Amino acid sequence: GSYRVVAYYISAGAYGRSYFPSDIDYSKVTHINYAFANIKDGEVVVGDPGVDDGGKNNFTALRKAKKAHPHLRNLISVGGWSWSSGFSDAAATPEARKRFADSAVAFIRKYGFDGVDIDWEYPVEGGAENMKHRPEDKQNYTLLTRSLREALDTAGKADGKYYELTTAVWGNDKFIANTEMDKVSRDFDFINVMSYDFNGTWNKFSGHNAPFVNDPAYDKPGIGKTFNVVSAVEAYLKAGVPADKLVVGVPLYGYSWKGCAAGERNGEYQDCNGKGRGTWEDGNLDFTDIEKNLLNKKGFKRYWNDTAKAAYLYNAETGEFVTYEDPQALKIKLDYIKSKGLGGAMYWEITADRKQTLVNLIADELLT
Ligand SMILES: CC(=O)N[C@@H]1[C@@H](O)[C@H](O[C@@H]2O[C@H](CO)[C@@H](O)[C@H](O)[C@H]2NC(C)=O)[C@@H](CO)O[C@H]1O
Structure with missing residues (x-):
């Protein structure tokens, strides 16, 4: 078919959650994104040796899944909310970009991944308390993306296979102000729009994590009229993300x-x-x-x-x-994906729905 279904799997699954890559129903997805690899001294590195490349050995389980499911593509997600502090430095010079890109290729070869998801939160401004920024991030996000696309094509040619490059982008349209989405769109295979985290306990007032459209009844302080799925999707379309590459995030x-x-x-x-x-x-x-x-x-x-x-x-x-996320709201979003010709659906994260109520609706609407 035409539509992707991109499931984030969290490394912490292999702890108290007791949800391992072997518990995934791989028939319900096109892509697993492995959250996360960390950045140490400018290089992609194993996030958690206790469960990733050792101990519970999540990576061994994911390679076993690829062998049982030929359709399946598994990507390593670099960064996330907690581990984005190393991106600014990595993207800042041609030498740093090569160092970073070459470490990413080394990682996916070593651990058997089919490409890289850049989860940089976020260029220029926004992110966790430990996050690092510089104004040059706006142009440097484009240049790091280009370094990676180049390193991954070269390695793909050497290896007799195709490596994907993807990214997770903010639901907040400040992200569009602070990047060149028109440029990077030519290098990313697809773009996972994080069309959620619109409201949360950071606010002392209640609100919707992922409202489909603007509700003008909601007028609490500094909550933007664009804090909704349709607003985020239209913003990334206007910024020059092609419809077919725009994947709609679901919580x-x-x-x-x-x-x-x-x-x-x-x-x-x-x-x-x-x-x-x-x-x-x-x-x-x-x-x-x-x-x-x-x-x-x-x-x-x-x-x-x-x-x-x-x-x-x-x-x-x-x-x-x-x-x-109620099924009534998710059916509207799946209809909207089809009406707009979008790249499919993304979700954070697969361990959070053990009966697969949302997982199964997404799979049945986009894959069958
Ligand atoms: C509309 C907006 O600006 N929302 C912000 C949230 O995005 C942000 O939450 C963070 O969102 C990320 C996705 O963009 C998540 O990866 C990250 O885990 C999440 N952080 C937290 C603490 O849950 C919040 C948090 O400060 O700020 C909002 O303004």
Whole structure:
């Protein structure tokens, strides 16, 4: 078919989550992205030797999957929220870009990957407390991308195979202001738009993680009118990302607050009293957890916003508000992918949906 299904798998799966690459149903995807490799002294390096290339040996399991599933393509994701601090230096000079690019080729040859996903959060501005930036990141993102495309073509020619280069990009359109998406689009095989994390516990007020369209009822301070999927997709199309390369990100987790005022809206867009219940940490629920414990269950009632096209849960007793991806919202996004001729769907992350409620809907709409 025409459509990709790009599943992020987190290395931390192989700990408490007890979800290993062998637990993946590879028939439901086109691509696994392995989150993450780190950057040390300008080089792509193993993120966690305890489960990646040793110990639980996630990499051995992923190569075993490629042999059982010839369609499958596995990419190593470099960076992420926590490990993006090394990108600015790596992209800054031709020598750093070569050093970086050559280390990336070395990595995928050693560990049997089919290419590289650049998850740089984010060029010029934005990112974790430890993140590093310079103004030259705007041009340097283009130049590092070109170095990688060049290193990967050369290595592909040597090796008798094709290596993919992809990237994860911010749902915030500041990312477009701070890059040359028209230029890098010619070198990336496809672009995973992170069309989620629009609202979260960083706000003391509740909101939707991934609302489909702008809801003008939502007017809390500094929340942009473009903090929604359709706005993000149209922004990247206008910035010069070709429709066929634009992959729409979907979250398989939810965010929660506690002590949200009910107001007129059953806790939606209301002042709250910090993080709500979570699975592996406060304020972040696996879809598995929501589905089993919360979805019209234990005092949590499901509501639908027919403007934003998003569902939420509210517990009037505790004032706990959950934003999560309902099947009603995800069907609208899968229809929208087809109507716009987009590159398919991406999701963070595959361990978060053990019954495959969202995984199966995505697979059935885009692959069959
Ligand atoms: C619309 C916007 O600017 N949202 C910001 C969020 O993106 C950001 O959350 C981070 O989003 C990344 C995806 O872009 C995730 O990889 C990352 O894990 C996530 N960080 C956290 C702490 O969950 C938040 C966080 O400060 O800020 C918003 O403004």
